[PDB]
Amino acid sequence: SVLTQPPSASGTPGQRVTISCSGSSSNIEYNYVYWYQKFPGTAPKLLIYKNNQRPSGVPDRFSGSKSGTSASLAISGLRSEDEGDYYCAAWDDILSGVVFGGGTKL
Amino acid sequence: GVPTYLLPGSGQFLTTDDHSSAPALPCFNPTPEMHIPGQVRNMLEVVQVESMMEINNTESAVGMERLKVDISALTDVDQLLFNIPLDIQLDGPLRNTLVGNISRYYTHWSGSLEMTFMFCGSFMAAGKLILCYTPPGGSCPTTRETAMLGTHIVWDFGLQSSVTLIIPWISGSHYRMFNNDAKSTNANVGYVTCFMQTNLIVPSESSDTCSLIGFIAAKDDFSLRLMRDSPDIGQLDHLHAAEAA
Amino acid sequence: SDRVLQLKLGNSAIVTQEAANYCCAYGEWPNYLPDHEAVAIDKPTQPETATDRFYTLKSVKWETGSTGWWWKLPDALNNIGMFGQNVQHHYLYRSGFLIHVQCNATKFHQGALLVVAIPEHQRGAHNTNTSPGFDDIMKGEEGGTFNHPYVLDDGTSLACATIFPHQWINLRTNNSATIVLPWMNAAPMDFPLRHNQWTLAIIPVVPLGTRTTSSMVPITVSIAPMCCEFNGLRHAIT
Amino acid sequence: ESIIKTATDTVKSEINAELGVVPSLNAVETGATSNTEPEEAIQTRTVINQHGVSETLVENFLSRAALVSKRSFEYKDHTSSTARADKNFFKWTINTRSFVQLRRKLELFTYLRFDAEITILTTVAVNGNTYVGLPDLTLQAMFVPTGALTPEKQDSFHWQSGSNASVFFKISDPPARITIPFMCINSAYSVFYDGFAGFEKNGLYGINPADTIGNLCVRIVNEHQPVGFTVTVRVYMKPKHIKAWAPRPPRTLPYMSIANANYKGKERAPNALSAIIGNRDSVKTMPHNIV
Amino acid sequence: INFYKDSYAASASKQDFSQDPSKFTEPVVE
Amino acid sequence: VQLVESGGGLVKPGGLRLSCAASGFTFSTYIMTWVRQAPGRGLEWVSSISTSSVYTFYADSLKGRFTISRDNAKNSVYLQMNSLRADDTAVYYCAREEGFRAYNLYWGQGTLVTV
Q1: What SS3 state is found at C81?
Q2: D56 to each of B44, B229, D53, D262, how far by Cα in Å?
Q3: Residue D175 sits in which domain range?
Q4: Among A57, B80, B243, D233, which residue's beta carbon has the most beta carbons within 10 A?
Q5: Residue B34 is nearest to which of D101, D187, D279, comparing CB atoms?
């Protein structure tokens, strides 16, 4: 009943990085995965919801996807503003609560 | 003796035999039969009782909150409030009702359904809604000008806080069946949509959000056929207590 | 008409001006046990005005978060007045019940209480194979609350609880609900101390809401036993 | 009361400009189901309905042979087979709560008065390779009341069955079948019981011994063979002459035990404690067809 | 066909078409 | 659409209420959550409360020290953190769920509660 994220996602010259999320049948297999970005002084900012959908205001970047488990967030551009701390969230049926992963991108 | 011959089906155990078997206890006298309230002889008596619809299937509704839909005051006209998938032999807002539960023991069904809505807002709350029924064939109406063309009723909240929307038996066949296909012509019943007729106008001292409770029953022209094994229950293992066999 | 109703039982009376009707469980009125149904051969007691009368419970209140309340019968009355005295001194009893639930609010309030009388409401526990214990079911004049009113605390559906004898208290329509219960049991009489025939549940299907200044809104339950007979007189138990 | 054999007919209907009359306005708060007729809500035609109501009679709905017991045991020499194992016989306390189809179908009522038709079906299988054939064994099913002592061994002198009702049957024959009457000390069985069966505040909750029928002691009458077999006995129950009282809401959550109504839902909807019905996007979402 | 001496040994009773649905649908006192 | 919290700064084992306030929507149709930042640690969801206030969810880490509340008449939501610890020093945001669990699109500004 735990989500697992890589601690660091380096590679910021303009590449396309991939942030990953590891879950189980409790959380990711049957529930939607949501991706938030977080900056040290701003409220969390939703980037992807329901495994692929972007809110209104998010650029065509931040694709996001899921394959049974192992949700993936893909960012294209690695700009100066992109530097942040990305979290994979999802609801857990065993815990009956929400779980985040935690992973900072460099 | 009598000359006889055995037929195919001899010595077979059909679970719907309807024969007479050997009395294990001879000369047994059962307890005298007394009057108990509430005797049932036909499950069609049971299906005719109203039962709450779980119209709020959303993940944002937990437990009891799935048994009511909330109306609010809108700033646009002719807006859609909710839908009801009329799939009786499938899972949806109608599956966990008396009519739905008892019907899912059977394969075929016929007859009219009864849809009742109770307004559970304030006394000082007013409004008019329109509950429409669309026969099968197309998409669910998303505008009121499209839904008003079917079987509907406009109703105004008042001293009678309840209205009934009859879903008439409009079929080509005598019965509708179940084959797990929702878009089958022998299964699809149509849709139920609710729109705002005028608006929900509440004072500033009443709660601005008011709830409807939907009920579903069956009329006395309803019937069922071809008993099933109820996909609404099942076990993958033996239960807890196994004593002693 | 159907909104005004007066119930007069013994030395007690209830008047209500904002009512709907009253329900007779399964369309039947309580009676006395006839001779072709009797089993116990001793003369019954039948204290009529001393027991057939309204008794009022502890008047629970409901705020935001309320899941519902229940009372088992006759367990909720087994220690109140002459009825609870006849119950402690006799071995068998037989009674119908007249239940009257009161709930008043202003005309700026919402809320819909479901008042259900469940026959033989065998309860279940949650995440446990161990059966519910004695102190889990026998609560007395104070009753209990629902852990999971969605499943009626037994794995069934609250949505289908409308086959049981029920009434609604919708605050915009009425402020009282009345159900008449006959004797429902497999036996003509029964031991009132180890078995309940009825459970009276009040469940807030629509929460209490308003934007005026908040008051305490209590829900009161009056129960009159009807056509009480008691058999098997001996000393009293506690 | 009234005799209803077919569904009811519909009558022709006309335009209504009724002032003071409101057939569709009702009062759910009274506890009464709305008496709105289809002839009063739309314009109807005259329909002569010929659909029967036979298949929903509680006699038809409940009188069906259903698996109540299924017990396998070993037919061998149990000299060194020390366990709680069923040596060459088993005891079973008759109940209708071990298999969930018949349990849920029977628990739709508070009280039920019926006669039980018990059918026993026995199959045998070789333990092992080295197949040589299946024997035609004779079995004995002795009916023993709930408050009577049962055999302790296969060659017990308790199987002499003085007045205990017993049936001997072969595996090669049709299944055994007997009728057990309505055995309750009350006028109906209690499918539900919110009480305790004793006087000393520590009896079991929800079960009274008045409603359990008895024990069923099944043995293999033959003595063991030089090789071993595994024997499965399946019991089927068919209620007849049924009377049903006070219908109840169906069980939505999966059963946990045969001793109590304890509930734990499924991990997620449908049939979860949080949600009995499966979820959809919104209340304005319809899993429907477009073109 | 019932050649047994007990009445409960008979076959099921599939001919009871009486019913009162108002016992549950309108248990009101009207 | 608009959320504003209120609270922060107290002794080790004390308690306090956070009392967020919402203005731009109905508020009686949405599920409101709390989420702490806990500097040095990542985001972790704290609690949720349903519209009817009958169902509460309470992340298991914190055992029973928190009690999420709700007032649909005043459009506010509270935490009432009890028996605080120094581990509970964090920035607490209130969010509005958008019809699905864990789907928060609108967040408060956050209140720093220092223990």
Answers
A1: helix
A2: 7, 14, 6, 29
A3: 1-291
A4: D233
A5: D187
